[PDB]
A paper describes a structure:
To investigate whether the SARS-CoV-2 ORF3a N-terminal region containing the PIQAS sequence is capable of binding to TRAF molecules, we crystallized the TRAF2 TRAF-C domain and the TRAF3 TRAF-C domain in complex with a 16-amino acid peptide from the N-terminal region of ORF3a (residues 30–45). The crystallographic asymmetric unit in the TRAF2 crystal lattice contains three TRAF-C molecules forming a trimer, while the asymmetric unit in the TRAF3 crystal lattice contains six TRAF-C molecules forming two trimers. We observed density for five residues (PIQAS) of the ORF3a peptide, which binds at a solvent-facing groove in the globular region of the TRAF-C domain. The TRAF-C binding sites are not fully occupied—in our model, each TRAF trimer has either one or two peptides bound, which is similar to previously reported TRAF:peptide complex structures. We also co-crystallized TRAF2 TRAF-C with an ORF3a peptide in which the isoleucine was replaced with selenomethionine and collected anomalous diffraction data. The anomalous difference density map at 4 sigma clearly shows the position of the heavy selenium atom, which further confirms the position of the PIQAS peptide bound at the TRAF-C domain groove. The ORF3a peptide forms several main chain and side chain hydrogen bonds with the surrounding residues from TRAF2 or TRAF3. Of note, the side chain from Q38 in the peptide forms multiple hydrogen bonds with two serine residues in the TRAF-C domain. The binding affinities between the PIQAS peptide and SUMO-TRAF-C proteins were in the range of 150–200 μM (192.5 μM for TRAF2 and 171.6 μM for TRAF3). Crystal structures revealed that a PIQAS-containing peptide can bind to TRAF2 or TRAF3 at the previously identified peptide-binding surface in the TRAF-C domain.
ORF3a is a transmembrane protein capable of forming homodimers and potentially homotetramers. The TRAF proteins participate in multiple NF-κB signaling pathways, functioning as adaptor proteins and E3 ubiquitin ligases. They form trimers and interact with receptor intracellular domains and other proteins through their C-terminal TRAF-C domains. Since the putative TRAF-binding sequence in ORF3a is conserved between SARS-CoV (PLQAS) and SARS-CoV-2 (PIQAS), and generally conforms to the TRAF-binding consensus sequences, we hypothesized that SARS-CoV-2 ORF3a might also bind to TRAFs and thereby induce NF-κB activation.
Residue numbers in the entry:
A (entry chain A), B (entry chain C), C (entry chain B): 334 to 501
D (entry chain H), E (entry chain G): 204 to 208
Amino acid sequence: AMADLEQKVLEMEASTYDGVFIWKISDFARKRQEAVAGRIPAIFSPAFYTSRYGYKMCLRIYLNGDGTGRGTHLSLFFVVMKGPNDALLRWPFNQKVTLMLLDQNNREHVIDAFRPDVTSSSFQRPVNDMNIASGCPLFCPVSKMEAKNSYVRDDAIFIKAIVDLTGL
Amino acid sequence: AMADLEQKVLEMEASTYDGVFIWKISDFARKRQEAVAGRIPAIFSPAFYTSRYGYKMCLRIYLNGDGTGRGTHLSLFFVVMKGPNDALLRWPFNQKVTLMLLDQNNREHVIDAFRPDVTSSSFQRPVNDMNIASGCPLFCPVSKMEAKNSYVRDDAIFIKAIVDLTGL
Amino acid sequence: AMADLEQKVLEMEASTYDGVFIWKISDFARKRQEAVAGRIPAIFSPAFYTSRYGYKMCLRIYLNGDGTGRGTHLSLFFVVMKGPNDALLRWPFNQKVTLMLLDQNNREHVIDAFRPDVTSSSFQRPVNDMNIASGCPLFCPVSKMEAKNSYVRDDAIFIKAIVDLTGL
Amino acid sequence: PIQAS
Amino acid sequence: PIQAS
């Protein structure tokens, strides 16, 4: 009831419709310690879209890493979600995805990118609320976060996603 | 009360501001039955706009037909609504309107375009919440959306409207 | 919580993300009398943005004037507010601002504009919720608000702001 | 620009 | 892209 509508409002506050998304993660130190302790291994971002009626997507982050990144890296993954208009879209999802951790001095961003593996279940038309997340287990070393740095400033970080819209 | 703000959130979720609107009608079979049985002959779409501060508009559908199409056709209508910025706009409303029923196999969409008759009360500056509707009583034969029709897929249909922006 | 949710929903209803904002001030005669009587000297507009993740801004109006305009002019000011992404933006704020009172016969708008004084605290990175407002105390003589005039119509006026986006 | 008083 | 575990 109340909580459902609250989630709807926050989702709508965060949504974008041009395939460009900036995720501000505040209270970074506590959330990272929550990951280190295993209490909250991962966090989902709000959803965003490639166009007004396009693909629905979100991000998933592990502040203390997943898989090969466990214990040493921030791991960051892309998620194709079940969207209201999926029946109108091309499948499999086949857009290049660029993911960054922003330097708040703007000098040296962390940036990674990939093209979808169209054979992977991660990029098929969703049958559940989300497909399996796919992306970069070795996205960013935890040491870059812990030492003197400009990625974490005022206890927040910014993650930016750019979904290329070629062909859409 | 709560229902008021639930309605407000739903309208905001569906609003567009570039004259292009896609209306997904789910639970198609149930709503068709409600229309055939006379309980809910018509449904209004959420509102959309020609621009951020432009005309306010919605659609009205009769899943079992209205007027000449009653009982034989889907009937689809366009509605000029009282908008918050009407005092800044030109009246009568004079933009081309294109309405479509989307084939979900990407086959022949049903498409009708019209230009407003500027002498009609449907297009004068609204005095009530909604002007009188205008559109196509014979938009699509009911028999054309049946088993293996491809307009209905997974119990949903998609209606698209495009309002031309020339001169705005 | 419903009060807080209502506020968020109203903010989102009014937000724009391209530096263009139109502020409809309804109940004009009552609000102007409230200003004349000193009970509510000033009104703040909803917030708007230069881009999806850009500067957060609002307007502040004195319907019976402030400073040199007090009692003889509408005074209209621009406010830089603390936005969620300020750490990503360039400071000081350096964008030209155009402010207008719209003629609802669209013949003679009131318009003023300024370049920010980049040495002023009004344009530094905000530490409080808003910076000190700055703008035009002599924006519009109150005589232009008379009934024979076409700025007030059906007990409402329209204010427009255009934040130039050069270099963003 | 002039600041609001 | 590598899938999450």
